[PDB]
Every structure is written in C-alpha cells, then in structure tokens.
Ligand SMILES: *[C@@H]1O[C@H](CO)[C@@H](O)[C@H](O)[C@H]1NC(C)=O
C-alpha cells in the first residue's frame with residue numbers, strides 16, 4: 001500500500017452516553033467516547049446506527065437470568081452495578097425476544113446495549129480524524145465499516161437512493177458510496193502475482209532473469 | 217370475494233447494490249398465485265396490504281392484541297400531510313407490506329396506476345424499504361381505518377417463509393423473479409440458476425414421507 | 427466457498443479482526459482456515475483425476 005484514507009460522517013456532537021447510565025432509549029447522531037459479538041476495546045473504531053439501551057431496575061439476584069440460553073443471533077454489551085449501602089412468575093406462554101405478579105421488595109442497573117450496523121447511513125461512532133481522497137494508488141481503506149486495501153476510481157454504477165454499498169456476482173465489495181454521496185469503485189487490490197526465475201544452471205553462469213506473471 | 221395475486225408482492229431484500237446477477241434468498245415472501253380476501257383479520261406475522269382508491273378515499277391501520285383499551289396498540293394515519301404514529305392504550309394502486317420480526321415493525325411501499333373494474337389488477341411490481349419501527353409490542357390482529365363520505369376496495373395477503381430467485385438488471389433494479397416452491401419446474405429453475413433449460417432429466421432435492 | 431461460513435462468527439476477515447483483537451479472534455480464524463484449506467485441497471485432487 002501507499003497511503004491511508006478515512007471517511008467518516010461529518011456530524012459532530014456530544015453524546016448522552018453518560019447521562020442515561022446514571023439517572024428503552026435511542027441514541028443517534030452523537031459521538032460516543034466509551035459482550036456478545038464485539039470486543040469492548042474494539043468498540044471505538046466501528047460506526048453503527050441508532051444504538052439502543054434497555055434500562056430497568058433489578059437486584060443482583062436476577063442479573064444471572066439475562067443472556068441467551070435476548071435473541072440468539074443478536075449481539076450487545078451488558079453493564080451492571082449494585083448499591084445498597086416488580087416481576088411476573090405467572091403468564092400463559094413466554095414472550096418473543098425484545099417484547100413486553102409480585103414485588104421483589106428492595107431493602108438495605110442492567111443496561112443491555114444493542115448495536116445496528118451497516119444498514120442505514122452511519123450516525124453513531126467515536127472520534128476518528130478524517131482524511132482526503134486519493135485515487136489510482138494502492139492505499140488503505142477506513143470507510144464507515146470497510147477496512148481493506150485497493151485502488152480507487154470514479155464509478156458508473158446507478159446506485160438506488162437507499163443503498164450505500166455494492167456487491168459483485170460473487171458477493172465481493174467492488175463499489176461503495178462515500179459518506180459525501182459519491183460512487184467510487186474499489187477495483188482489485190492493485191496488483192499481485194507469481195515470480196519465476198530463469199537460469200542457465202549455475203554450471204555456466206550466475207546470471208538469471210525474472211518473470212512477473214500477470215502485470216501491465 | 218377471493219381473488220388471485222399473480223406476481224405481486226416483491227420487495228428489495230436488503231440495502232445492497234447488485235447488477236447482472238441472480239440471487240437466492242430465503243425470507244417471508246408472498247408466494248405467486250395466492251388468495252387475497254377482497255374487502256369492501258389476524259396479522260399472522262406478515263400482511264401484504266394493497267389498496268385502490270380514487271382521490272385518497274380512505275387511509276389508516278391499527279395493530280394490537282385485543283384492540284379494546286386493554287393492551288398496547290399501534291396506529292398509522294395522516295393528520296394533515298404527515299404520518300402520525302403512537303403506541304399507547306388507545307380508545308392509483310397503493311402497495312404496502314408489513315412485517316413483525318424481532319420487535320421491529322418493518323414497512324415497504326410501492327405505487328402504480330391501474331384501470332380495473334371491481335377486482336385486483338395483474339402484473340408485478342416492486343417495493344422499497346421506507347420505514348422500520350421499534351414498537352416493541354406483540355401484534356396479533358389489525359384493522360384498517362376508513363374515511364366515510366365512491367367505491368373503495370382494499371386487499372389482504374399472507375406472507376410465508378419461502379425461497380425466491382430474483383433477477384437483477386444492469387441498471388441495478390430487480391426485474392423478474394421465480395418462486396422456488398410453486399411448481400416442480402420452478403424448483404428446477406432455482407436449482408440450475410436459469411430461465412430456459414435444455415431437454416433432459418435433472419435430479420433435484422430429496423423427499424421424505426413425514 | 428469463500429462466501430461460506432464454517433461455524434465462525436463471520437465469513438469475511440477484517441470483520442472478525444475489527445470486532446476482536448486477541449485469542450478470541452484466533453479461535454474464530456482457525457475455524458475459517460480449516461474450512462478454506464479443505465475446499466482448496468478437494469479442488470486440487472479433482473483436477474489431478
Ligand atoms: C401475543 O399475544 C397473544 C394473545 O393471545 C398470544 O397468544 C401470543 O402468544 C403472543 N405472542 C407470542 C409471541 O407469544
């Protein structure tokens with residue numbers, strides 16, 4: 001590669017990521033600062049859409065009941081904290097995931113964050129200094145959620161207004177929409193191939209020629 | 217009045233661009249040539265609601281379990297020019313699709329002129345991902361909200377989990393499709409990934425007597 | 427067979443390395459490496475025949 005390219009939504013704002021914890025709520029168009037499918041330390045480099053937080057009050061006696069075994073194919077982040085210094089055990093049938101008698105009787109919370117990614121235009125993610133666009137040179141990609149390597153060039157593909165990525169006939173990403181609404185196709189990882197050495201046999205000389213297989 | 221829907225009820229499975237390719241996908245679709253109850257209605261996890269009106273005769277939808285001041289319900293209407301949605305204990309061809317999957321209530325839209333007499337028109341079209349809402353309620357039934365004053369008629373279909381073979385044009389839009397569970401021939405098409413097939417004998421999926 | 431998962435979280439690299447950074451990613455990558463190594467060996471044998 002030859003350079004680094006980054007493109008992030010230009011929206012900037014301070015995020016209520018802190019207010020909600022200490023006091024289902026949606027968070028969007030913010031810049032959070034800061035697990036079942038993601039690593040906590042890796043959360044500040046990916047851009048999601050409309051992260052949701054589920055909040056309710058339950059004592060530590062019930063924290064060990066919230067986990068798959070919550071959908072089974074879904075991910076999220078769970079925090080908990082106790083300080084001491086209602087529920088239903090009767091219902092005809094259970095409930096499908098993410099849908100909604102006695103009293104615990106507290107005497108002296110659980111946040112289930114949900115991440116949605118690569119569906120709508122990116123609106124929720126942390127600090128990332130942007131960069132200018134470079135074309136026709138093997139570079140690195142750091143688009144909203146596409147880290148790779150290749151060569152960029154303007155595209156001639158008629159994207160629908162509700163689409164933001166591209167796909168080939170084999171499910172490879174040969175196109176993208178810049179967060180500034182531009183269709184540039186990232187064709188091929190610049191160049192690669194094989195190397196073959198032609199020698200007369202080292203019993204008559206030590207001079208060799210080199211062939212590069214598939215290159216302009 | 218039971219009518220037949222030839223090839224209506226096709227929508228974009230995802231928000232990805234594709235060209236000159238055939239895509240095999242499994243989801244809740246409306247199988248080609250099914251029954252639509254022409255109304256002049258339990259949700260059952262999916263409803264193909266299409267209406268034909270002359271100058272916006274009627275509009276509205278309600279979703280809930282009991283639908284009478286006992287449990288949560290959802291509303292979709294027009295107040296003056298914008299869509300109004302709320303979730304509390306309440307008191308020439310439209311084409312819509314409603315789906316309730318993991319809390320979120322998805323929606324798709326389409327439009328088309330039609331010149332018909334008293335039933336649904338033929339042909340096919342496509343819808344698009346316009347809305348999706350985290351209502352978070354359990355939906356069992358629904359019922360449209362009419363606008364009393366001209367004849368009006370709205371239809372209802374049912375979505376079931378089937379596999380479709382969608383054809384994409386170089387311009388990037390879905391053009392045709394094949395329902396891989398309607399005919400023995402349709403299964404053959406979805407297996408060799410074509411629309412015309414040479415004569416011969418081709419082996420397809422296995423069968424069991426349940 | 428490249429667009430086919432083999433029991434891992436995702437079938438595309440840079441989407442396990444993006445959401446994981448350590449042994450957790452090694453356990454997923456080993457599932458993909460094993461699966462892609464078999465389909466490549468099967469291809470070569472059928473070509474020899
Ligand atoms: C929704 O409510 C109805 C009311 O009878 C119930 O039968 C159904 O099971 C509920 N939904 C689910 C997913 O259980």
Ligand SMILES: *[C@@H]1O[C@H](CO)[C@@H](O)[C@H](O)[C@H]1NC(C)=O
Pocket residue numbers: 385386387
């Ligand atoms: C594709 O689009 C072009 C112009 O946008 C149009 O002329 C053509 O009929 C469309 N369909 C094709 C080429 O199959």
